[PDB]
Amino acid sequence: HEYGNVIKKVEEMKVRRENEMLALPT
Amino acid sequence: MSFVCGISGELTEDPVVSQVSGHIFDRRLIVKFIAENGTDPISHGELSEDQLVSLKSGGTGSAPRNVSGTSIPSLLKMLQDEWDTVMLNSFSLRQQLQIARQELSHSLYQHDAACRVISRLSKELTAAREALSTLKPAILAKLEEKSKSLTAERKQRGKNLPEGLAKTEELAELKQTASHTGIHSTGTPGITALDIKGNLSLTGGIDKTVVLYDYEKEQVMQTFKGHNKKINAVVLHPDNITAISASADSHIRVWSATDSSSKAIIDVHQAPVTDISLNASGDYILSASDDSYWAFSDIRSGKSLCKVSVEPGSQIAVHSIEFHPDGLIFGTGAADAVVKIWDLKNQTVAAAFPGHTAAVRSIAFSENGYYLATGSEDGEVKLWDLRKLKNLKTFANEEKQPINSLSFDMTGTFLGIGGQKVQVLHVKSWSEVVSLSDHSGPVTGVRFGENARSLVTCSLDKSLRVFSF
Amino acid sequence: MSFVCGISGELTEDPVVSQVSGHIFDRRLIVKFIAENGTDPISHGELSEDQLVSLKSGGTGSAPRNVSGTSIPSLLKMLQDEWDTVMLNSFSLRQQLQIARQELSHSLYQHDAACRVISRLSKELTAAREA
Amino acid sequence: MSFVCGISGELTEDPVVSQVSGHIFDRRLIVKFIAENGTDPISHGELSEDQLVSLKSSGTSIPSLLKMLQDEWDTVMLNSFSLRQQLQIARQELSHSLYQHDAACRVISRLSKELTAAREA
């Protein structure tokens, strides 16, 4: 309820995976 | 999706949008706004609680704690300190709103005053360019002596009012106790002007006659004839014998109760005369006209000492004029709704008062020497203080019916008001004491008896009537 | 503009809301979406040109955004979140106390176990001597 | 009407009842209970956020309201502490009781074996 903004922490981790790595789904 | 409320400026967990604006709001706040005002807070359109679209995406998450906010009592400390700033910010806004409205009034005043300079200079330039485009080859000492006498003798009356003054509780019981009819012909009906001197009275009519009448003897005293057009104003002299009258034929004519002939004619105006006023000593008469000049003249010989335009280089209808009762200054009122105060010693504008929203049909000065009243077609009445040249108080009728006449009482305790109905104000309280509507048409004059013991009014209803308690 | 479109994932310059929507759309997105789909991108309601309304900012009276992070709503919110946590904690503590207190009340055999020992030992003290 | 939440024991502005037990809760607490425990807090049956049924439904001074929050918060925390203190006392009494029981079993075991000797003297 308080630190629910950790969803954006893994999005920042996701961005480091989406940049400098493999293809997104098709 | 991060959103913030247009009302509070904070984040909102429940954003909502009105159908009549693009702005977004926190739901509970805008609903309370709608519940009070029924309107959009920013576009001011009509708004209802069903005209809302819900921005039901994910709301704004919680802010992180401050390090001091990690404990419950320090959150309460933080909440208290936060609240003090919010309260003082709200207090700062209402202070700032007072300051802004104060400065705007001064700014508009300075701009208005600047437009007077522009207008005066623009006319001087037009006259200069017109000349190019068509170029072809003890009186003053007496008044101060008299005014200081007049204003000094007042000072005892200012300290104590007469003990015989009628009470407010008596004036609350005013009723119709005399009525007089047939003073003027029914083919051109209505009393156009009235003045009184005790039971003696002088009346004008549309029938071109001037009739002197006693409303206690129920009889005509004398009749005068010779005016080519309707009578607009009359003055009855303190000697009870001399009578003064003004006609739309641009001439002022002077009469005597003892005489069958014109005592004088004062050819001094180019246009219909609209109002006249009598100097406190009775030696001289002052007049105004549609020609925009004021002119100051001997009642007997018709010679004029001085004459100046109320608005040089322009034509503006002047609708009211009155001496200040010490006699050195007089007020003037015109269709531009400017009231100008003139010094007779310098023969120049002493003060100018933008005020009413419409033409000033009547002006009154108090014999206390400092209350002034002006009355207009816009249906307001305003009280003015000459000691600082400022307004005191305003009174009005919500129907905005024109006011045709005003009169203070002889002591300046009461102000009589006349328009579509008859009213009297006790001026120090500025409260309506009574209102009377017994006339079937517009009122054309208001006067008071001695010690406020009687009230006299006239109307277009073909009647002269007196009220007393 | 600071609103980000829920479909394209990029910042708007023409935000649009409709009564069956909830996520923001661009005007230049939704009109072609109406033409091909005719269908709400998120709720699959029917779309029509009279539903769309466009958002605006900076009108007269609009309050300045509080950026200082602290606010009365957010403090009352987190104080409420503290209270919810403490009551759910207290409830599970109260539940555990009730369970532990209950079984120890049932386990109060000490006086009756002692009488059985007295009965047993007094038998033993006779059994020890009848031999 | 006044409605009391079965979790908090306090009045609620938004009373809710659970069909899995018929007990009345504050909507916000029970949703947080479901979102953590997935169960009815009283009956321990499976419960979910769609199963809640809604029930029907001036200020004084800001320093005064803040002082009520202070005094009230100290009361809630006093309750939380005394529960932890009473819980450990319950656990200490319980472990002693089990120790009395297990020691009594040792005695009853010991004596019942010694009572066999009288049959073989």
Nearest to D18 by CA among B97, D43, C58, D32: D43
**Chain B residues touching residue C53 (CB < 8 angstroms):** 17, 19, 22, 53
- Crossing angle (nearest 10°) for helices D62-114 and B72-133: 160
Report phi then psi at B305, rounded to 5: -80, -40
**Chain A residues touching residue B61 (CB < 8 angstroms):** 4-5
**Chain B residues touching residue D69 (CB < 8 angstroms):** 76
- Give me the amino acid identity at B67: V
Apex CA D47: angle with CA D46 and CA D52, to 5°? 155
Kindly report the nearest CA distance between residue C17 and chain A, in angstroms. Answer: 25
**Chain B residues touching residue D73 (CB < 8 angstroms):** 72-73, 76
In the block, tokens 């003015």 appear at B384
Q: Which helix H or strand E contains D100, and what residues bound it?
A: helix D62-114
Q: Please state how this structure was obtained.
A: cryo-EM
- Give me the amino acid identity at B79: L
Other CB atoms within 10 A of residue B74 CB = 14
Torsion region of B9: left, alpha or beta (phi above 0 gives left; psi -120 to 50 gives alpha)? left
The single-letter DSSP state of residue B86 is: H
Q: What counts of helices (H) and strands (E) characterise chain B? A: 4, 31
Is the torsion defined by CA of C100, C105, C107, C111 positive or negative? positive
In the block, tokens 């002047």 appear at B318
Residue B280 CA neighbour count, 13 Å, CB half? 24
> The tokens of D119 are what?
């049959």
Q: Which helix H or strand E contains B395, and what residues bound it?
A: strand B390-396
Q: Are strands B293-298 and B284-289 parallel, antiparallel or unpaired?
A: antiparallel
Q: Are strands B264-267 and B273-278 parallel, antiparallel or unpaired?
A: unpaired
Q: How far apart are CA B101 and CA B462, in angstroms?
A: 49
Kindly report the nearest CA distance between residue A15 and chain B, in angstroms. Answer: 19
Kindly report the nearest CA distance between residue A10 and chain B, in angstroms. Answer: 16
Cβ-defined contact of D62 to B79 (cutoff 8 Å): no
Q: How far apart are CA B463 and CA B201, in angstroms?
A: 13
Q: Chain B: list its partners (3+ Cβ pairs within 8 Å).
A: A, C, D
Residues 6+ apart with CB under 8 A from D5: D11, D12, D15, D24, D25, D26, D29
Q: How far apart are CA D4 and CA D14, in angstroms?
A: 10
Cβ-defined contact of D66 to B76 (cutoff 8 Å): yes
**Chain B residues touching residue C23 (CB < 8 angstroms):** 1, 57
Strands (E), B93-189: 175-181
Nearest to B342 by CA among B333, B327, B329, B352: B329
Q: How far apart are CA B234 and CA B403, in angstroms?
A: 19
What is the DSSP secondary-structure string of chain C? ---B-TTT-SB-SSEEE-TT--S-EEHHHHHHHHHHT-B-TTT-PBP-TTT-EE-----TTPPPPP-SS--HHHHHHHHHHHHHHHHHHHHHHHHHHHHHHHHHHHT--HHHHHHHHHHHHHHHHHHTT--
What count of residues does chain A have?
A: 26
Resolution in A: 3.0
Q: Which helix H or strand E contains B274, and what residues bound it?
A: strand B273-278
Nearest to B10 by CA among B75, B89, B69, B76: B89
- Crossing angle (nearest 10°) for helices C72-106 and B72-133: 170
Q: How far apart are CA B280 and CA D11, in angstroms?
A: 82
Residues 6+ apart with CB under 8 A from D24: D3, D4, D5, D6, D12, D15, D16, D17, D55
**C88, C93, C131: residue with CB nearest D118:** C131
What is the DSSP secondary-structure string of B291-311? TSEEEEEETTT--EEEEEESS
- Residues of C (69-88) whose Cβ lies below 8 Å from D: 79, 83-84, 86-88
**Chain A residues touching residue B65 (CB < 8 angstroms):** 2
Nearest to A2 by CA among C68, B68, B61: B61
* N-terminal to C-terminal alpha carbon distance within chain B: 77
Q: How far apart are CA D33 and CA D26, in angstroms?
A: 11
Is D111 at the interface with chain C, CB within 8 A?
yes
Q: How far apart are CA C88 and CA D76, in angstroms?
A: 12
Rounded alpha-carbon distances, angstroms, from residue B354 to A11, B303, C41: 68, 33, 63
Cβ-defined contact of C76 to B79 (cutoff 8 Å): yes
Judge whether B86 and C72 are in contact, CB under 8 Å: yes
Residues 6+ apart with CB under 8 A from B312: B120, B123
CB pairs under 8 A between A and B: 8
Burial class (CB in 10 A: 0-12, 13-18, 19+), B330: buried
Rounded alpha-carbon distances, angstroms, from residue C96 to B164, B312, B359, C92, D31: 94, 100, 88, 6, 21
> The tokens of B156 are what?
């005892």
Q: Which residue of chain A has the CA closest to C82?
A: A2
**Chain B residues touching residue C60 (CB < 8 angstroms):** 42
Rounded alpha-carbon distances, angstroms, from residue B179 to B99, B189, B203, B210: 55, 16, 15, 20
Is D108 at the interface with chain B, CB within 8 A?
no
Kindly report the nearest CA distance between residue D68 and chain B, in angstroms. Answer: 11
Rounded alpha-carbon distances, angstroms, from residue B330 to B25, B372, B407: 59, 11, 15
Report phi then psi at B384, rounded to 5: -125, 145
